[PDB]
């Protein structure tokens, strides 16, 4: 008889499945640890009216990107960048696009409109995002101003999760095997010493990020620039060891210009040598709130 064929099943379109053919590159946004992020328009109607999205893709780190995608898929918070979906062995992460970019780009261009009050509001928002991430049992491991996106003049969001790891249930930290290309000038002593990462290690990193925020991400006042002034620039493979000794002595990044001592004291609580002595994200939120109102 006639040719037999398969009954075509009822198909429901997945709003989180972006077709390669419609995902059109505009420009690069940034690079970060084996991945790169691009501005695209997803333009199924082919008329330049589709939504702008941030697309993360790789240049076996496919496995790491897959875990990152799955972490971000299940994070839902006002101060965490929004997952939109995937474009599919290979895969791309699709996220909302925030035109104002990172705090590293934004703050130097917007000093006049961002006063201390607004800086402290951003600080709270970063803390709420981090306290949410820690309540899901993750350590970020890459908290710096360059990874904080500007949604608006009034709102920031944590914008990349390239290094984010789960902490095991009933355990206090994650041991990092891979520690090359580590942001050492943002890292707590236990991270530099023993490759161990606690929620308190993220609190330390937040202190450094707060410093960046208060200096408006001035390149000449960067945590890297200031620490290398402290320890000596040209030491190469000995740099991290000299950094560790500096922190053991009790030395810390100085008070930002025009930063009130009361704000600096909150920052210093992020930088107690022992993780267990550091402030929490919630106590920081209470601290900033008190200085705001
Ligand atoms: C979070 C900042 C960042 C990190 C790594 C690569 C690129 C970027 N940049 C600069 C970026 C990311 C963005 C963005 C706007 N810029 N909008 C949504 N995302 C994920
Ligand atoms: Na899952
Ligand atoms: Na989500
Ligand atoms: Na733009």
UniProtKB/Swiss-Prot annotation:
<feature type="modified residue" description="Phosphotyrosine; by autocatalysis">
    <location>
        <position position="174"/>
    </location>
</feature>
<comment type="similarity">
    <text>Belongs to the protein kinase superfamily. Tyr protein kinase family. JAK subfamily.</text>
</comment>
<feature type="binding site">
    <location>
        <position position="56"/>
    </location>
    <ligand>
        <name>ATP</name>
    </ligand>
</feature>
<feature type="active site" description="Proton acceptor">
    <location>
        <position position="142"/>
    </location>
</feature>
<feature type="binding site">
    <location>
        <begin position="29"/>
        <end position="37"/>
    </location>
    <ligand>
        <name>ATP</name>
    </ligand>
</feature>
<comment type="function">
    <text>Tyrosine kinase of the non-receptor type, involved in the IFN-alpha/beta/gamma signal pathway. Kinase partner for the interleukin (IL)-2 receptor as well as interleukin (IL)-10 receptor. Kinase partner for the type I interferon receptor IFNAR2. In response to interferon-binding to IFNAR1-IFNAR2 heterodimer, phosphorylates and activates its binding partner IFNAR2, creating docking sites for STAT proteins. Directly phosphorylates STAT proteins but also activates STAT signaling through the transactivation of other JAK kinases associated with signaling receptors.</text>
</comment>
<comment type="subunit">
    <text>Interacts with IL31RA. Interacts with IFNGR1. Interacts with JAKMIP1. Interacts with SHB. Interacts (via N-terminus) with IL2RB and IL10RA (via its cytoplasmic domain). Interacts with FER.</text>
</comment>
<protein>
    <recommendedName>
        <fullName>Tyrosine-protein kinase JAK1</fullName>
    </recommendedName>
</protein>
<feature type="modified residue" description="Phosphotyrosine; by autocatalysis">
    <location>
        <position position="173"/>
    </location>
</feature>
<feature type="domain" description="Protein kinase 2">
    <location>
        <begin position="23"/>
        <end position="292"/>
    </location>
</feature>
């Amino acid at each position: 008889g006639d040719i037999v064929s398969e009954k075509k099943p009822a198909t429901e379109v997945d709003p989180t499945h972006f077709e390669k053919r419609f995902l059109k590159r505009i420009r690069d946004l940034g690079e970060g640890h084996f991945g790169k992020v691009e501005l695209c328009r997803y333009d199924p109607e082919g008329d330049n009216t589709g939504e702008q999205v941030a697309v993360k893709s790789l240049k076996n780190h496919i496995a790491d990107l897959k875990k990152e995608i799955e972490i971000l898929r299940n994070l839902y918070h006002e101060n965490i960048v929004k997952y939109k979906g995937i474009c599919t062995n290979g895969i791309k992460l699709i996220m909302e696009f925030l035109p104002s970019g990172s705090l590293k780009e934004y703050l130097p261009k917007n000093k006049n409109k961002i006063n201390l009050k607004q800086q402290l509001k951003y600080a709270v928002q970063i803390c709420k995002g981090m306290d949410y991430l820690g309540s899901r049992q993750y350590v970020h491991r890459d908290l710096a101003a360059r990874n904080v996106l500007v949604e608006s003049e009034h709102q920031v969001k944590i914008g990349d999760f390239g290094l984010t790891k789960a902490i095991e249930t009933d355990k206090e930290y994650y041991t990092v095997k891979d520690d090359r290309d580590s942001p050492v000038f943002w890292y707590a002593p236990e991270c530099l010493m023993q490759s161990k990462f606690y929620i308190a290690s993220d609190v330390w990193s937040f202190g450094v990020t707060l410093h960046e925020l208060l200096t408006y991400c001035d390149s000449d006042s960067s945590p890297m620039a200031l620490f290398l002034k402290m320890i000596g620039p040209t030491h190469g493979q000995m740099t991290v060891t000299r950094l560790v000794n500096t922190l053991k002595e009790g030395k810390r990044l100085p008070c930002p210009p025009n930063c009130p001592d009361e704000v600096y004291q909150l920052m210093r609580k992020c930088w107690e040598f022992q993780p267990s002595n550091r402030t929490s994200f919630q106590n920081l939120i209470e601290g900033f709130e008190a200085l705001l109102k």
